Design a protein around this ligand. Structure first.
Ligand SMILES: Cc1c(NC(=O)c2ccc(CNCCO)cn2)cccc1-c1cccc(NC(=O)c2ccc(CNCCO)cn2)c1C
Lengths: 121, 119
């Protein structure tokens, strides 16, 4: 009954740009931070580990340091939004958002990074 | 950090036998059932979805009906044990236990099913 949805499960992004990938969960009235867990990962790499309102940046995988953050202002709209700055080719793959809030659910999201290309016509 | 561990991360099982795969999670004093979620899957197939003490058999994947059980006597010892009855060849693959209990964590278990072979 506790359901996480994704508007899209495939994001095609340009090398070196910014991307935001979103996972929706139901929230009514006061977001209870003490009951909320948000985890983002990409093939076992810890990107975001938001646990009961607190984050520890020492658990964050080194290839995501100063690039990856949770947009905490979106959480009141039931939106766990992961913003990644300066997208790399190694950022392509399968991301998971995993959310515990009342129930639990997770989604898979595929990211494709186009190789850098000077398109001329 | 809430941590789930696995004694074995690979199980080799005989076709048609039973297996039990275990995920350990830390539990102190009274198991707070209102706070606990245990979820087992394999390749997006819902095997066990234990939510605060309640299970919906109607959410279980058709291929696990009457075959898959969570051993609830183990939960008080912090053991999330999935027992699968009458193992098929299509039970081979990657299982996941996901546990929310204070914190949250999940682990992967690989199951390989040996094709039936006569001595
Ligand atoms: C597991 C989990 C996290 N994970 C972390 O916080 C986390 C942090 C760090 C590490 C790595 N550590 C390595 C050291 O061992 C790993 N995990 C965060 C929020 C929630 C969960 C959770 C916990 C328990 C259960 C369910 N699912 C389900 O209950 C579930 C049920 C049904 C479905 C299928 N639904 C499809 C329809 O949308 C999916 N799902 C989830 C999703």
């Amino acid at each position: 009954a506790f359901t996480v949805t994704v508007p899209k499960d495939l994001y095609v992004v340009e090398y070196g740009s910014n991307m935001t990938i979103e996972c929706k969960f139901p929230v009514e009235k006061q977001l209870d931070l003490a009951a909320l867990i948000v985890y983002w990962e990409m093939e076992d790499k810890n990107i975001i580990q938001f646990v009961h309102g607190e984050e520890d940046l020492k658990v964050q995988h080194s290839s995501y340091r100063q690039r990856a953050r949770l947009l905490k202002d979106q959480l009141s709209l039931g939106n766990a939004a992961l913003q990644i700055t300066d997208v790399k080719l190694q950022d392509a793959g399968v991301y998971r958002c995993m959310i515990s809030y009342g129930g639990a659910d997770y989604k898979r999201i595929t990211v494709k990074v186009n190789a850098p290309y000077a398109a001329a016509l």
